[PDB]
Amino acid sequence: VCLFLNLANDPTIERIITPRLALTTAEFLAYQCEKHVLVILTDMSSYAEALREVSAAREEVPGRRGFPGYMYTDLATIYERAGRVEGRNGSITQIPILTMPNDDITHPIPDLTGYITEGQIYVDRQLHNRQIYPPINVLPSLSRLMKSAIGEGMTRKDHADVSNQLYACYAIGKDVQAMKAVVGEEALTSDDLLYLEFLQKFERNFIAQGPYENRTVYETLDIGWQLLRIFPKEMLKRIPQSTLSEFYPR
Amino acid sequence: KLIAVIGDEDTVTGFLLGGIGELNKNRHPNFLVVEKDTTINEIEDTFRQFLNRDDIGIILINQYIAEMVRHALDAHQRSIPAVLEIPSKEHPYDAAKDSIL
Amino acid sequence: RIEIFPSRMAQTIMKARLKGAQTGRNLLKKKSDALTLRFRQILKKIIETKMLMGEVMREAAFSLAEAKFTAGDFSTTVIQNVNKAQVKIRAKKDNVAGVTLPVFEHYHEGTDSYELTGLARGGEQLAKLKRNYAKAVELLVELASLQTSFVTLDEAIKITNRRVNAIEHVIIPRIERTLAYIITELDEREREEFYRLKKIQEKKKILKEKSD
Amino acid sequence: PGGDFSDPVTSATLGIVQVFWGLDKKLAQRKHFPSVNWLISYSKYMRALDEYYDKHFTEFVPLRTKAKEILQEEEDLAEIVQLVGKASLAETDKITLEVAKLIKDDFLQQNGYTPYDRFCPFYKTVGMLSNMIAFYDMARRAVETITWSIIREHMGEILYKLSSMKFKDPVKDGEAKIKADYAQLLEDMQNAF
Amino acid sequence: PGGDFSDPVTSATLGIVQVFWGLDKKLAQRKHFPSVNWLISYSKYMRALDEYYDKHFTEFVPLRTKAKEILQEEEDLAEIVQLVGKASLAETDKITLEVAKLIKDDFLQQNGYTPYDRFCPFYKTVGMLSNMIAFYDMARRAVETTAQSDNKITWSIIREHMGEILYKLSSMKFKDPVKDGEAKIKADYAQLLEDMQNAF
Numbered sequence: 001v002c003l004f005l006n007l008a009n010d011p012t013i014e015r016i017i018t019p020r021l022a023l024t025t026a027e028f029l030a031y032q033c034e035k036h037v038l039v040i041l042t043d044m045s046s047y048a049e050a051l052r053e054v055s056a057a058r059e060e061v062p063g064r065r066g067f068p069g070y071m072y073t074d075l076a077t078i079y080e081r082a083g084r085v086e087g088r089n090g091s092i093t094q095i096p097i098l099t100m101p102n103d104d105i106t107h108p109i110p111d112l113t114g115y116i117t118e119g120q121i122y123v124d125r126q127l128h129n130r131q132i133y134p135p136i137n138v139l140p141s142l143s144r145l146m147k148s149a150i151g152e153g154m155t156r157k158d159h160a161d162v163s164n165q166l167y168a169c170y171a172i173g174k175d176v177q178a179m180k181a182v183v184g185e186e187a188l189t190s191d192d193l194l195y196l197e198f199l200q201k202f203e204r205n206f207i208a209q210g211p212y213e214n215r216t217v218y219e220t221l222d223i224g225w226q227l228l229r230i231f232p233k234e235m236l237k238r239i240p241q242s243t244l245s246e247f248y249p250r
Numbered sequence: 251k252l253i254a255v256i257g258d259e260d261t262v263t264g265f266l267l268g269g270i271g272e273l274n275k276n277r278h279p280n281f282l283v284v285e286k287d288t289t290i291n292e293i294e295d296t297f298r299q300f301l302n303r304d305d306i307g308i309i310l311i312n313q314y315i316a317e318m319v320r321h322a323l324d325a326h327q328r329s330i331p332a333v334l335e336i337p338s339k340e341h342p343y344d345a346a347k348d349s350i351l
Numbered sequence: 352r353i354e355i356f357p358s359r360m361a362q363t364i365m366k367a368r369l370k371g372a373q374t375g376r377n378l379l380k381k382k383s384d385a386l387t388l389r390f391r392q393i394l395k396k397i398i399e400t401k402m403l404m405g406e407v408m409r410e411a412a413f414s415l416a417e418a419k420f421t422a423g424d425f426s427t428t429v430i431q432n433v434n435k436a437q438v439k440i441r442a443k444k445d446n447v448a449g450v451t452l453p454v455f456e457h458y459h460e461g462t463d464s465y466e467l468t469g470l471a472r473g474g475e476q477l478a479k480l481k482r483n484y485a486k487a488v489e490l491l492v493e494l495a496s497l498q499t500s501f502v503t504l505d506e507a508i509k510i511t512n513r514r515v516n517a518i519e520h521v522i523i524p525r526i527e528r529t530l531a532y533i534i535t536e537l538d539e540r541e542r543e544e545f546y547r548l549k550k551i552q553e554k555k556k557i558l559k560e561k562s563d
Numbered sequence: 564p565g566g567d568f569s570d571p572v573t574s575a576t577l578g579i580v581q582v583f584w585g586l587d588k589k590l591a592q593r594k595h596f597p598s599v600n601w602l603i604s605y606s607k608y609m610r611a612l613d614e615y616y617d618k619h620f621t622e623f624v625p626l627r628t629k630a631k632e633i634l635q636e637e638e639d640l641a642e643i644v645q646l647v648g649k650a651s652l653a654e655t656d657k658i659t660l661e662v663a664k665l666i667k668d669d670f671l672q673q674n675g676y677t678p679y680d681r682f683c684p685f686y687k688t689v690g691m692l693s694n695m696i697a698f699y700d701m702a703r704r705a706v707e708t709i710t711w712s713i714i715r716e717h718m719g720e721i722l723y724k725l726s727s728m729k730f731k732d733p734v735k736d737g738e739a740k741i742k743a744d745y746a747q748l749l750e751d752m753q754n755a756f
Numbered sequence: 757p758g759g760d761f762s763d764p765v766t767s768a769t770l771g772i773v774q775v776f777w778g779l780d781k782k783l784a785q786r787k788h789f790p791s792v793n794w795l796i797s798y799s800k801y802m803r804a805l806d807e808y809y810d811k812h813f814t815e816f817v818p819l820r821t822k823a824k825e826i827l828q829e830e831e832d833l834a835e836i837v838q839l840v841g842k843a844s845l846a847e848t849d850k851i852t853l854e855v856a857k858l859i860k861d862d863f864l865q866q867n868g869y870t871p872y873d874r875f876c877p878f879y880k881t882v883g884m885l886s887n888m889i890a891f892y893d894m895a896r897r898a899v900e901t902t903a904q905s906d907n908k909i910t911w912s913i914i915r916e917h918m919g920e921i922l923y924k925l926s927s928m929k930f931k932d933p934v935k936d937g938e939a940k941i942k943a944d945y946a947q948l949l950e951d952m953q954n955a956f
Binding site for chain 3: 251252253259260261262263264265266267268269270271272273280283307308310327328329330331332333334336337339342343347348350351
């Protein structure tokens, strides 16, 4: 890990040359040495505030909502120094952490990054106050290249299908919890008795990974089938019959 | 908190024998036998008499008898007391109070 | 119809007002749908039992022919020595979707009144006519417990499906076309400060070349 | 009072500060003092403190992780009861709804113009949190089998003792700690019923 | 521009003008002319003008106090019947919803191109308002005093029986300027038809 970090005390011109210093070593390690680099750009929303100070230092006019007009280039200059090439077997992967203010996705920092990047991961506040530790919301967060990234040659054969079912059973799990408060806990349906216990096991056992608990992709899908031990066979409509017969009985 | 019955002659002698009748000498009897020579007004007031009483929970009445007092029970659109339509020995239950849907 | 003043912090307030009214409909939609599903299967239970009592009231009234044909005439004896009731009602309370529901409970108590009736001729064609009409009144209080349950649901599904259609067609399109007004009124001030700031940018240059 | 997270003096503040006690105006309309609302407020200083907590106050961290749970599980249910009406919707979640009202008026409320509530020490603070969460684990298992409609005024002498713990003198050092031990064992007899 | 009164021309005007006749755009789709919106409009000449009113027209200050009030209670009850329906409404409020609707086509509507409403004098204006408010005041007593005991007036009694007197009210505005002293007599004559029917 080659960390370098810029405090709030530090000069704000150094906050612009920090992602420039980040990727130009991360594309020396990926396109001049053959490593697989992963770049983490924390506090992105604090980067565009350091772009606003320099743009208003040379006496420019502002743009939409204060941020300058060329921010879609300056973000694309540091987001699109990624991907992998054909001449070498190196690669560079970006996870830019950014905090949208006041839960507004129409803000120009989480909107102009939605046109350059490839799908979001949505940390939620309602999950955090319930005090599961990683607050990753599964419903509004999709990975765009998730289809290409998994498979039998990559990680596993049933990974393309158990991820399609865990999200789908969580979707039917959500309105069942809202149904519990509107009619009653026992008189609703015999179907919703079983989805409601999975949501207690999906929240606490699967996505409430501990602070130091490492968990491989094989250890993840083992919990992925432990939660699908519930909902006996031919309820899981998304999983095909080939991969369902192999992994579900154990 | 008792049951009322209009019915007919052969109906009311079976349901009194069932054990639903009560003779209130103060207010009124809780049943009304209808013969061949009972006016429709006598069925009309007694339907209103059973409706205004607080202790009446069910009003049993044959649909063959309730067909002429259909206009009065179509004005009763409350939940309590419940009006029930029972078959006679002629023309059984066909088309009463399932007509709300 | 516009509600309040635009152009700061009312957009976030109206986005809180919209989000509450968006799932407030969907919560009340599931209430009105579970009420209708409770109303749909209670219709068939009315249908399957209102023809079933038509057989029981044909079977028990057939026993009325099995009845005074043997033993005289039960048309003045039974209608002249009744004082109190033997089978009564108790008003219990059911509940579905948070709506209180009246239900009638069977309650036989107190005495017999036609214990000594016939007794010298008949009395076995009677008191099975009682059992044919104690079972008939046992079924008919269960159907009265659903007849007063049927019409109280259609008074609570109509005053719920209006509140669905009041939120869906009045409250939300008043909030939605208010939120489209705060956006443009923000924009008509964001280009107003672009004219005042660019006027100073030109007046800082004209004052500069006057010095040069 | 306004511009909650969209104000360039507040939006620049939240990127620097670690603790943020949001004073809410909805609680100040009902004169809830202090007016800190417990949802939008935060503290980044929860990892740096448990090394101190597991030395002195070893009981506190398992209380606070559930003390913040109860205040949110009531928050969604308050959006339910407002629309569909209080049919109480549950019994395992009704006990959470009133042990939160115990928290929002006895634990969280604090009138600073009294000679007792103007400063609460930590052993008076972790004492009230231990007692009012021991009512929450014991009445959770009590409905694993009774209903809170029985419990509410059957344990009314205990619900008065939990609401009256915030009146003790700040000079009662051992005597408030015995009172914490006294009121907790009296709930143990009632759950043994 | 666009019918928006939050405008730097209008907002700088209303700090200077004392009277403000706020016209409405919804009141011109429905042909309600003149389209003066009676809720947002105001005037600050009233306290200064009742001294004139206590000399010439000595009954009009209690008239507009109830005439503005019946238009005030109609607006709060209009939002009621568009959400929860008019079936659950009370009887002291259903009489309010009719006379305020009787005001909105008689009093406030005025066809400026016909010979009788192109210019009305002030005795004609105080004339038909002294009757429609007295009608609301008399129909107040038909619900208030006999409230529970008798099988009372449910106002469908009134609306199907007093339709000829309401036709005298709904056609009172048709007095062209060929009659001057006759209009005050007809104002008390249509009141005398309104006077006797509370006994009937």
